[PDB]
Amino acid sequence: RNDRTLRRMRKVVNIINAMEPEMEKLSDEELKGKTAEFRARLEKGEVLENLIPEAFAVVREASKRVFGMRHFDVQLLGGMVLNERCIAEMRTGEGKTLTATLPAYLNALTGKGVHVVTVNDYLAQRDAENNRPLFEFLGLTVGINLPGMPAPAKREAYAADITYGTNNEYGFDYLRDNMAFSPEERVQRKLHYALVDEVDSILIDEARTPLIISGPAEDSSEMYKRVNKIIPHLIRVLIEELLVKEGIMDEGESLYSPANIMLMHHVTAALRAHQNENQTLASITFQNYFRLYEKLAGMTGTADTEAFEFSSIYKLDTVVVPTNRPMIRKDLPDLVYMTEAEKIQAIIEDIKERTAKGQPVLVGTISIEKSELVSNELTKAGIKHNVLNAKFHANEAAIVAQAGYPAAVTIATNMAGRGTDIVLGGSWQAEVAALENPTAEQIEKIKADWQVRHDAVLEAGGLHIIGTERHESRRIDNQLRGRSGRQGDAGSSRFYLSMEDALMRIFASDRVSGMMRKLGMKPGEAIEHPWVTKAIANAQRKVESRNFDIRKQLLEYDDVANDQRRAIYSQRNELLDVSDVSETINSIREDVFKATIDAYIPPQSLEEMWDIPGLQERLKNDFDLDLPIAEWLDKEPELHEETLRERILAQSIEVYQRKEEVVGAEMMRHFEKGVMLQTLDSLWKEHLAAMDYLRQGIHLRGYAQKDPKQEYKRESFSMFAAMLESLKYEVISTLSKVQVRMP
């Protein structure tokens, strides 16, 4: 799979490289000209993928000229990966941010937009501004989208060829677009391509995080009095006592009905209770926001392990991109000791032995106390070193700078991801950055000195990483080890574990674990077994896998809400996009008036079988339509069920035409549209609140036994279909009963 894709891509790389001379000979204007020229071709029905070699060749040359930098072949590969529904895994230091100029350019050609998704505003802003002169060189515009930005500025940012901004704010824009009353209010365009800069946090860790817009844009207060008023007779089964009372729920209904849920919430708040609240107007999770893009792609580092998750949550394939130089870091067999003490003793040994050959070491621990421990023992053994202490960030940046210096030893606690590159030999710019007026032959010096240090650290084996314990998450171990062997540099790594260590628990048999014990790891000595390393890694994988199972069940609950939100927003946007909702109105009125009479007159039925005590009233009650109708048919005996069905619809229409000559065609059309949006909104927010309740009234509504979800999907899909019909009927009522000072 990865092997043959990569082969096929290496072939296209060789095409691109051969085009380099053509792009070189080209003037700056001629280069800017390729864009319109690709677009002309696309307009004539070219396939965008056929453009990859020339477009990449064009972007590569532009970047030589604007940035002074020329995409490496691995970067060309990474770019082609990101044209597909894929994650490019590119090792820290491989140049993700330059890589990303390639797919961003290519996927801008069709004029549909590109969303570059950064983790924070600083990078959005930084990247937009760094790339603006590149992409302007190429006749594209760039937009920057930020929180607080006004809507007209936002509209421009989204109308640029390429956009930068954080995941959050993309989401938030989406929601507010789905709260618009006119389509000119939208800031976004159709969601074309999302290129996510760091997928681990953005797509995975934060997959289920809801984006919520709330607004004290509540409404009602009556209920909390009504429902309170019942409570000063509640005196320490208990469903029935509650049920049978008032002018809400009269008709022998059920309160524990997933339907009366807001009510039940009212009573159970009123009982718990012994200015306006701001409800959710709109929600989406990130995972479901990303799933809306026609095309999705992104980048992460080589630390992987979550390929199975990207695939199942997002259908993102993943391509492991080679590094530009050979990755020669030596990841040695995990070692396993009886006790911590024995473990540390052999850790200190390793460090002793290495720092004496001039090799620098970075010790990653799982806690401060674990740090202080390995530290103090290093001091006991006479080994100089420094701890990165999270309280002294300044000291930490200075430590980190000399951390590749010969025989340097640095201890870090639960170390993060990416982090500052550690330069072997020490950093030599960090050194002239300290020189308040330098020279050519001071510089010469610093650098000569440094090459000698650097070549000696490489020759001593590069940065050695020591993991004093492993994490449950291998991704994290992998990020630790990944700080060594960057850009082809020698380095190595080794993890230590002991039988005393926390992680021993991940095997889930305590005695099955205590069998390595029976290889009693003798004091002086040591062996290495390749199967242990794979056991451990396998176990880390199984914990990850079971965690993701747990999470798949959560995402299934989520798919219920996604499916309902997609459908309803789809309906809302059909309406929004139409200036004239009138024929939709005509059809719903018919739907509503057929069903409404059906529930009183049975189709193709006998006058013997028709009723008014509730009908007659229902029509006056919900429609301000008063047809004292009994007599129509005892005074005009012949017409018939179908010529009358017709006739009531006709009336209703006549009262409506009447109100409209009074108000204005347009004014009316626009009101109806407004009513249909406002009512869909109301219902939907009601619906969301009710689902949230069920969903929590269902971590425990009942039983280890039967199926909680399932029943929940059914209840919830069911209320969504009820809401769909209640929307038709509530819109028609409104239009029927609307007051206007007449003739």
CB of 434 to ligand ATP, least distance (A): 9
Q: By CB under 6 A, name the one of 69, 119, 271, 578 that touches ligand ATP.
A: 69
Q: Quick one: 249 or 432, whose CB is closer to a copy of itself?
A: 432
Q: Quick one: 70 or 552, whose CB is closer to ligand ATP?
A: 70
**With contact defined as beta carbons under 8 Å apart, do 261 and 254 qualify?**
no
Phi first, then psi, for residue 615 (nearest 5°) are -65, -80
CB of 398 to ligand ATP, least distance (A): 11
Q: Quick one: 72 or 600, whose CB is closer to ligand ATP?
A: 72
**With contact defined as beta carbons under 8 Å apart, do 149 and 125 qualify?**
no
The structure tokens listed for 706 are 């039967």
Query: Which region among 10-18, 85-93, 506-514, 553-561 touches ligand ATP (by CB under 6 A)?
Result: 85-93
Q: Are strands 491-498 and 386-387 parallel, antiparallel or unpaired?
A: unpaired
Q: Quick one: 56 or 593, whose CB is closer to ligand ATP?
A: 56
What is the DSSP code string of 148-168? T--HHHHHHHHHSSEEEEEHH
Q: Quick one: 439 or 509, whose CB is closer to a copy of itself?
A: 439
**With contact defined as beta carbons under 8 Å apart, do 489 and 462 qualify?**
yes
The structure tokens listed for 270 are 């009123």
> Is 75 annotated as contributing to ligand binding?
yes
What three-state secondary structure class fits 496? strand
> Is 97 annotated as contributing to ligand binding?
yes
Residue 297 interacts with ligand ATP (CB under 6 A): yes or no: no
Residue found by looking up tokens 């709330």 in the block: 214
CA angle 54, 298, 285 (to 5 degrees): 140
CB of 28 to ligand ATP, least distance (A): 20
Q: By CB under 6 A, name the one of 34, 71, 354, 728 that touches ligand ATP.
A: 71
Q: Are strands 386-387 and 409-413 parallel, antiparallel or unpaired?
A: parallel
Which H or E run contains 164? strand 162-166
Which H or E run contains 455? helix 440-459
**With contact defined as beta carbons under 8 Å apart, do 428 and 326 qualify?**
no
> Is 461 annotated as contributing to ligand binding?
no
CB of 421 to ligand ATP, least distance (A): 8
CA angle 16, 18, 20 (to 5 degrees): 75
Residue found by looking up tokens 């997609």 in the block: 566
- Residue 72 interacts with which of a copy of itself, ligand ATP, none, CB < 5 to 8 Å by class: ligand ATP
> What are the distances in angstroms from CA 712 to CA 194, 567, 697, 709, 740?
33, 19, 10, 5, 44
- Residue 447 interacts with which of a copy of itself, ligand ATP, none, CB < 5 to 8 Å by class: a copy of itself
Q: By CB under 6 A, name the one of 8, 10, 70, 517 that touches ligand ATP.
A: 70
CB of 10 to ligand ATP, least distance (A): 17
Q: Quick one: 123 or 691, whose CB is closer to a copy of itself?
A: 123
Angle between helices 708-737 and 665-696 (to 10 degrees): 160
Q: Name residues contacting ligand ATP, limited to 88-107 (CB under 6 A).
A: 90, 92-98
Q: Quick one: 93 or 113, whose CB is closer to ligand ATP?
A: 93
- Residue 628 interacts with which of a copy of itself, ligand ATP, none, CB < 5 to 8 Å by class: none
- Residue 70 interacts with which of ligand ATP, a copy of itself, none, CB < 5 to 8 Å by class: ligand ATP
CB of 434 to a copy of itself, least distance (A): 7
* Sheet strands side by side (includes 162-166): 142-144, 162-166, 115-118, 193-196, 295-300, 86-89, 317-320
- Residue 380 interacts with which of a copy of itself, ligand ATP, none, CB < 5 to 8 Å by class: a copy of itself
Rounded Cα–Cα distance for residues 637 and 24 (Å): 92
Q: Name residues contacting ligand ATP, limited to 447-486 (CB under 6 A).
A: none
Which H or E run contains 211? strand 210-215
Phi first, then psi, for residue 13 (nearest 5°) are -50, -45
Which spans of this chain sit near a copy of itself (rule: CB under 8 A)? 120-123, 125-126, 146-150, 153, 372, 375-380, 382, 384, 386-387, 389, 391-395, 397-399, 419-420, 429-430, 432-440, 443, 447
CB of 485 to a copy of itself, least distance (A): 21
**With contact defined as beta carbons under 8 Å apart, do 145 and 124 qualify?**
yes
Q: Quick one: 257 or 395, whose CB is closer to a copy of itself?
A: 395
Rounded Cα–Cα distance for residues 589 and 604 (Å): 21
Rounded Cα–Cα distance for residues 708 and 694 (Å): 10
The structure tokens listed for 48 are 């965008």
CB of 389 to a copy of itself, least distance (A): 6
Residue 72 interacts with ligand ATP (CB under 6 A): yes or no: yes
Q: Quick one: 440 or 742, whose CB is closer to a copy of itself?
A: 440
Q: Which residues partner with 210 through β-bridges?
A: 285
CB of 510 to a copy of itself, least distance (A): 20
- Does residue 362 come out as left (phi exceeding 0), alpha (psi in the -120 to 50 range) or beta? beta
Q: Quick one: 90 or 490, whose CB is closer to ligand ATP?
A: 90
- Residue 551 interacts with which of ligand ATP, a copy of itself, none, CB < 5 to 8 Å by class: none
The structure tokens listed for 481 are 């080890």
Q: Quick one: 57 or 98, whose CB is closer to ligand ATP?
A: 98
> Is 93 annotated as contributing to ligand binding?
yes
User: Exposed/middle/buried for 61, CB within 10 Å: 0-12, 13-18, 19+?
Assistant: buried
> Is 197 annotated as contributing to ligand binding?
no
Query: Which region among 15-23, 47-55, 68-76, 607-615 touches ligand ATP (by CB under 6 A)?
Result: 68-76
Q: Quick one: 312 or 376, whose CB is closer to a copy of itself?
A: 376
Q: By CB under 6 A, name the one of 39, 112, 330, 418 that touches ligand ATP.
A: 418
> Is 659 annotated as contributing to ligand binding?
no
Nearest residue to ligand ATP by CB is 95
Give the gyration radius of the chain's Cα atoms: 34
Rounded Cα–Cα distance for residues 329 and 90 (Å): 16
> Is 78 annotated as contributing to ligand binding?
no
Residue 612 interacts with ligand ATP (CB under 6 A): yes or no: no
CB of 380 to a copy of itself, least distance (A): 4
**With contact defined as beta carbons under 8 Å apart, do 33 and 71 qualify?**
no
Q: Which residues are annotated as a binding site for ATP?
A: 75, 93-97, 421
- The footprint of ligand ATP (CB under 6 A) covers 69-72, 75, 90, 92-98, 418
